């Protein structure tokens, strides 16, 4: 693939491989690994990350909704895929033909599904139990038993798994986490038979308590080399390798005189002769206007963003005159300087998860494997 | 093109059409309207908006960078396109072959392009002049003449136009806008022969002083029905029709008891027995975590977003029990209630420009034209 603007993101597939292989080592042999690649692999590239994770030791994948699962199948993925969120009862046959498992938490959903489906492909379900996250999942025994019965009665409905999800597994204090786990244990008792797959752990629960994972973990954030929470960093079993970096280049360089203003609202003023650089990245690329008090890396040195960030461009105060074309690193390392996604997240006043997901479709992803470029993906190419 | 999650954006091309047509009436028959459709038409859909705009009175289109212009061509658009930002001198032949005009502001760029291109297609250039925005553009006379001499000298280089861009055209106080407009007129006198197209106004400047728009107008934000700024609203010549709306549906409903917590970090606790609804939209969709305490519309009533917003989901406090499938409007109207992109931007502490752009590729766009559904665009 080709791109014609000097702004791009890089995905180190070697980092992804290692993060997943280190986990395969950590977890008991009886515990499967399901790589979470929803939201285009958290902005890292769905098919690329899925491929690497599966070769690193993962055996199944998970996405947020049906379209994401169909896209993976489209791109050639053959491994089992579970849709973690809601879906339409009417789309049951489509998912079944495509060998896509669905999460279920309501008996009325199955009522509607049975009315519209009768074979020949089976639908594998994963019953979601709400133990304290308050999002999706059953909460009472009655509904739990009815769901199982409706599935058990239809010839083409199969109960493949059952799970829950944690709201605070990334907090050093484990009061709530412990509550949910014990809650899960009690609710599991409502099931007449234990499904082949029982799971609860995400990245944080997996890495901290590998001995409390049942037989499948759903590995997400850590697979990308990102800490579930900076607070549990010291508690991580092995070093994480960040797989995402973002770059650009100077497309214009000029020396302002004292008094000249920069960007919208004439908000910035060069009060001394200074060199200003312009890069081809803005808020429509995920470099939100909010990151205007932040900085970037140029010539291994930090250069602050100057004035308001524009839709496709922004300016920075250069330390001195530099040539057009000089590489700029928004996320990554330059010499003795480094900008991490956690750094960006802190200035955006968010969590690392949100950062790469916001880097828009507009920005090409260059994939590296075995330290060499493996491929380029330009969504608008 | 269909989709399988109950979250989608709706784009009213009739609003797009009316906003543009209304400007065409405001401007003279000589003045061209250049529809700014970069960033996938500010998150509204590049092809769909480009087509509609042309039908309504636009004669040209503008994008941010080469890839955006090439994607339009591939999608069938055969109308003129100008790349507003920078490009590689090595890509000059590709732009020329695709009939894509390029913005230029450095003589060294031309020296490079010249050594790399010799035909057969001519390449149209638009010289950018920096009059106070401090982003792109030439700033001195010598460089301006050197650029022009390089263009006139090349058999396949054509200087089709020249322009500048305003930094404060949306501010009631017009002093910096004035300095800029006057600096432009001054720098224009550095050129030997004036090019066919001379432009400088965006939505604000063109709607405010359409009499001072020269040969072309670059119409962006107002085409989408959004005000360039809150302070200019009472200065707009005609009412703008908002083209973008966003909706979802409840996929789960349940009653919590006091003391029960919702979402990550359990930052929310039900103080009383309440009905909670779960919708399939989150920050990976552009619905940023910062909107946690924002209100959405459900059953014609405002319902607050409760708990931390997730990557693909979030929870809201319902007025009471409602059936799964109930329509939720994040941006739009429901009964007497309406939430505008401006309301969302106020909560996010940003400008309206940023909001539709952030609504991601995951969210399908349903287009309406002539009060009927024309097409569904599901990027994935
Ligand atoms: C059901 C389910 N199973 C596993 C994971 C993986 O978790 P990690 O990324 O912390 O390893 C998630 C993640 N989801 C959060 C991003 P969000 O809730 O914001 O979608 C999930 O929802
Ligand atoms: C050169 C240029 N010509 C015209 C327009 C249209 O302006 P309106 O959207 O206010 O009508 C723009 C817009 N660009 C801003 C969104 P941003 O500067 O953040 O990209 C521009 O850059």
Q: Which residues contact B27 (CB under 8 A, 6 or more apart)?
A: B33, B206, B210, B213, B217
Q: Is A228 in the pocket of ligand 1 (CB under 6 A)?
A: yes
Using CA coordinates, name the residue in chain B closest to A220: B311
Q: Please, are residues A114 and A96 in contact by the beta-carbon 8 Å criterion?
A: no
The CA-atom distances, in angstroms, between A326 and each of A252, A294, B103, B284 are 10, 19, 20, 31
Question: What contacts B189, CB < 8 A, 6 or more positions away?
Answer: none
User: Which residues touch A343 (CB under 8 Å, ≥6 apart)?
Assistant: none
C-beta of residue A203 within 8 angstroms of C-beta of residue A209: no
Taking alpha carbons only, the member of B268, B270, B337, B259 closest to residue B297 is B337
Residue B254 touches partner A, C-beta closer than 8 Å: yes
- Distance between CA B100 and CA B92 in Å, rounded? 9
Tell me the technique behind this structure. X-ray
**CA A23, A29, A31, A36 torsion: positive or negative?**
positive
Contact A125, A85 (CB under 8 A): no
Q: How many CB pairs under 8 A join A and B?
A: 229
Q: Is A168 close to B266, i.e. CB distance below 8 A? A: yes
CA nearest B168 in A: which residue? A265
Among A6, A289, A378, select the one facing B350 at the smallest CB separation.
A289
Looking at the structure, give the CATH architecture of the domain made up of residues A1-12+243-381: Beta Barrel (2.40)
Distance in angstroms (rounded) separating the CA atoms of residues B90 and B67: 14
CA angle B84, B89, B94 (to 5 degrees): 80
Q: What residue ranges do the domains of chain A occupy?
A: 1-12+243-381, 13-223
Least distant ligand from the CA of A225: 1
Token code pair at residue B64: 């941010």
* Annotated binding-site residue? B129: no
A381–B71 CB contact, under 8 Å: yes
Q: Match 């470029």 to its residue by tokens.
A: A373
Helix (H) or strand (E) holding A216: strand A216-219
What is the SS3 string spanning chain B?
CCCCCCCEEEEEHHHHHHHHHHHHHHCCCCCEEEEECHHHHHHCCHHHHHHHHHHHCCCEEEECCHHHHHHHHHCCCCCCEEECCCCCHHHHHHHHHCCEEEEECCHHHHHHHHHHCCCCCCEEEEEEECCCCCCCCECCHHHHHHHHHHHHHCCCEEEEEEECCCCCCCCCCCHHHHHHHHHHHHHHCCCCCCCCEEEEECHHHHHHCHHHCCCEEEECHHHHCCCCCHHHHHHCCCCCCCCEEEEEECCEEEEECCCCEECHHHCEECCCCEEEEEECCCHHHCCCHHHCCCEEEECCEEEEEECCCCCCCEEEECCCCCCCCCEEEEEEEECCEEECHHHHHHHHCCCCCHHHHHCCCCCCEEEECCCCEEEEECCC
Q: Residue A253: is it exposed, middle or buried by C-beta count within 10 angstroms (0-12/13-18/19+)?
A: middle
| Binary contact (B290, A350; C-beta < 8 A) | yes
Angstrom distance (rounded) from CA B359 to CA B44:
9
Identify the CA nearest to A222 among candidates A27, A9, A10.
Answer: A27
Are A361 and B379 an interchain contact pair (Cβ–Cβ within 8 Å)?
Answer: yes
Q: For residues A209 and A51, what is the distance between their CA atoms, to the nearest angstrom?
A: 26
Is CATH 3.30.300.100 the classification given to domain B13-223?
no
Chain-centre distance for alpha carbon A250: 29
Q: Is the CB of A203 under 6 A from ligand 1?
A: yes
What are the tokens at A149?
A: 């019965």
Mutation site, B100, B129, B135, interface A, largest A CB count within 10 A: B135
Q: Give the residues across from B305 on adjacent strands.
A: B316
Residues 6+ apart with CB under 8 A from A210: A26, A27, A28, A31, A237
3-state secondary structure B182-226: HHHHHHHCCCCCCCCEEEEECHHHHHHCHHHCCCEEEECHHHHCC
Question: Does A312 contact B39 at a Cβ distance shorter than 8 Å?
Answer: yes
Residue in this structure with the two tokens 């502001």, named with its chain if needed: B105
The answer to whether B299 touches B319, Cβ cutoff 8 Å, is yes
B132 and chain A in contact, CB less than 8 A: yes
- Quick check: helix, strand or coil at residue A335? coil
Query: In this structure, are residues B167 and B132 in contact, taking their beta carbons and an 8 Å threshold?
Result: yes
CA distance B156 to B116: 12
- CA-nearest of B364, B359, B357, B367 to B379 is B364
Pick from A225, A205, A204, A207: nearest CA to A341: A225
Instruction: Give me the helices (H) in chain A, please.
Output: 13-26, 38-42, 46-56, 66-74, 92-97, 107-116, 141-153, 175-188, 203-208, 341-348, 354-358
Please provide the distance, in angstroms rounded to a whole number, between the alpha carbons at the two ends of chain A. 7
Q: Which residues of A129-164 are buried (b: 16+ CB within 10 A; e: fewer)?
A: bbbbbbbbbbbeeebbebbbebbeebebbbbbbbbb
| CA A116 – CA B187 distance, rounded (Å) | 70
Backbone φ and ψ for A50, nearest 5 degrees, come out as -60, -45
Which residue do the tokens 């360039």 mark?
B228
Sign of the dihedral defined by the CA atoms of residues A58, A247, A281, A316, in that order: positive
Cβ(A48)–Cβ(A366) under 8 Å? no
Contacts of A309 in chain B (CB under 8 A): none
Which residue has 């769901």 as its token pair? A147
Report the candidate in A201, A217, A187, A198 with the shortest Cα–Cα distance to residue A160.
A198
Confirm whether B1-12+243-380 and B13-223 share one CATH topology. no
The token pair at A352 is: 């690392």
The whole-angstrom distance between B159's CA and the closest CA on chain A is: 20
Cα distances (Å, whole numbers) of residue A213 to A84, A189, A199, A205, B218: 18, 17, 6, 8, 58
Question: Which residues 6+ apart lie within 8 Å of B361 measured at CB?
Answer: A40, A360, A361, A379, B379, B380
Contact B212, B201 (CB under 8 A): yes
Residue A77: phi and psi, rounded to 5, are: -70, 135
Residue B99, CA distances (Å) to B71, B77, B94 in order: 13, 11, 9
Coil, strand, or helix at residue A156? coil
Resolution (A): 1.6
CA of B362 to the centre of ligand 1 (A): 17
B30 — phi, psi (to 5°)?
Answer: -75, -35
**Where do we find the tokens 């929310």?**
B268
- ω before A120 within 30° of 0 (cis)? yes
Alpha carbon of residue A359 to chain centroid: 12
Q: Is A285 helix (H, G, I), strand (E, B) or coil?
A: helix
Does ligand 2 lie within 6 Å of residue B221's CB atom?
yes
Report the C-alpha gap between B158 and B156 in whole angstroms: 6
CATH architecture, range B1-12+243-380 = Beta Barrel (2.40)
> Which of B275, B290, B311 would you mutate first to test chain A, the one with the most A CBs within 10 A?
B311
Q: What positions of A carry a catalytic annotation?
A: 38, 264
| Contact call for residues B118 and B161 (beta carbons, < 8 A) | no
Token digits of residue B36: 């700014």
Q: CA A357, A359, A361: angle at the middle one, nearest 5?
A: 100
- Is residue A83 within 8 Å of residue A69, measured between CB atoms? yes
Which residues 6+ apart lie within 8 Å of A253 measured at CB?
Answer: A275, A276, A277, A278, A318, A321, A322, A323, A324
Query: Apex CA A85: angle with CA B348 and CA A345, to 5°?
Result: 35
- Choose among A195, A234, A198, A203: nearest CA to A215: A198
* Close Cβ partners of A299 (under 8 Å, ≥ 6 residues apart): A319, A322, A326, A334
């Amino acid at each position: 693939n080709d791109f014609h603007r000097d702004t791009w993101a890089e995905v180190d597939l070697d980092a992804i491989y290692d993060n997943v292989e280190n986990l395969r080592r950590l977890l008991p042999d009886d515990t499967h690994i399901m790589a979470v690649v929803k939201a285009n692999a958290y902005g890292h590239g769905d098919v690329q990350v899925a491929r690497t994770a599966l070769e690193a030791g993962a055996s199944r994948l998970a996405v947020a909704f049906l379209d994401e699962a169909l896209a993976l199948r489209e791109k050639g993925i053959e491994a089992p895929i579970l849709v973690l969120g809601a879906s339409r009862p009417a789309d049951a046959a489509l998912a079944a033909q495509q060998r896509i498992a669905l999460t279920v938490f309501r008996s009325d959903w199955l009522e509607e599904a049975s009315a519209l489906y009768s074979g020949p492909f089976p639908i594998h379900f994963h019953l979601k139990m709400d133990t304290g996250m308050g999002r999706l999942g059953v909460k009472d025994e009655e509904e739990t038993k009815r769901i199982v019965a409706l599935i058990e009665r239809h010839p083409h409905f199969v109960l493949e798994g059952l799970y829950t999800h944690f709201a605070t597994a990334d907090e050093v204090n484990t009061d709530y986490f412990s509550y949910q786990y014990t809650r899960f244990l009690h609710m599991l008792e409502w099931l007449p038979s234990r499904p082949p797959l029982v799971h609860c752990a995400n990245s944080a629960a997996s890495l901290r308590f590998p001995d409390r994972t049942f037989n499948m973990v759903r590995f997400g954030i850590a697979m990308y080399g990102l800490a579930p929470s900076p607070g549990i960093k010291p508690l991580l079993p092995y070093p994480l390798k960040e797989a995402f970096s973002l770059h650009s280049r100077l497309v214009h360089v000029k020396k302002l005189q004292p008094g000249e203003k920069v960007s919208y609202g004439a908000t910035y003023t060069a009060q001394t002769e200074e060199w200003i650089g312009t890069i081809p990245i803005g808020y429509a690329d995920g470099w939100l206007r909010r990151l205007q008090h932040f900085h970037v890396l140029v010539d291994g040195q930090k250069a602050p963003i100057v004035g308001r960030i524009c839709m496709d461009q922004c300016m920075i105060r250069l330390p001195g005159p530099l040539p057009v074309g000089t590489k700029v690193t928004l996320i990554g390392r330059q010499g003795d300087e480094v900008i991490s996604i956690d750094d960006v997240a802190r200035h955006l006043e968010t969590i690392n998860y949100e950062v790469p997901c916001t880097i828009s479709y507009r920005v090409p992803r260059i994939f590296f494997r075995h330290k060499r470029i493996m491929e380029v993906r330009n969504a608008i190419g």
